[PDB]
Amino acid sequence: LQIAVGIIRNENNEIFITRRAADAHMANKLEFPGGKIEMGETPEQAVVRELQEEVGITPQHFSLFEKLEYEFPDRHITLWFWLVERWEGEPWGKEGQPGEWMSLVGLNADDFPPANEPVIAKLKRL
Numbered sequence: 001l002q003i004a005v006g007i008i009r010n011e012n013n014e015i016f017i018t019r020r021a022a023d024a025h026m027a028n029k030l031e032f033p034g035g036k037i038e039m040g041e042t043p044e045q046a047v048v049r050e051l052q053e054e055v056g057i058t059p060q061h062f063s064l065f066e067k068l069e070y071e072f073p074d075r076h077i078t079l080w081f082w083l084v085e086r087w088e089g090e091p092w093g094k095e096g097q098p099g100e101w102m103s104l105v106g107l108n109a110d111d112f113p114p115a116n117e118p119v120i121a122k123l124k125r126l
């Protein structure tokens with residue numbers, strides 16, 4: 001299971017975070033909008049499509065900030081963390097999910113999935 005997520009951050013060094021549903025894997029956890037990279041699709045396409053679907057924006061000139069693999073108690077997933085600094089549209093809860101800007105400095109890794117630990121840390125430096 002390959003996963004593409006977008007680390008969306010504005011000029012104010014804030015990132016746009018969303019909270020996962022109470023009945024989803026890693027429920028109630030904070031997260032970077034993202035989803036499964038589908039067949040016949042590239043990870044770059046997957047992140048654009050996913051952000052469009054989840055927060056209504058289209059990533060532009062983004063880079064791969066981090067790529068890693070994590071083993072959850074019942075599944076193994078590869079995460080593709082894209083740093084998105086330019087985009088069209090305004091990020092919002094397009095799928096009716098909680099969404100808001102969060103200072104990079106005040107992020108608490110414990111709030112996100114354990115898989116994001118290194119990314120969250122590395123983030124506090126760029």
Ligand SMILES: Nc1nc2c([nH]c(=O)n2[C@H]2C[C@H](O)[C@@H](COP(=O)(O)O)O2)c(=O)[nH]1
Pocket residue numbers: 003005024025026030031032033034035036077079112113114115116
């Ligand atoms: N969207 C998203 N999923 C994440 C993050 N970290 C992380 O482990 N995941 C995991 C949780 C899910 O098992 C999977 C995403 O699949 P869904 O979007 O279908 O929930 O990847 C993250 O920052 N964003």
Ligand SMILES: [Mn+2]
Pocket residue numbers: 033034035
């Ligand atoms: Mn998702």
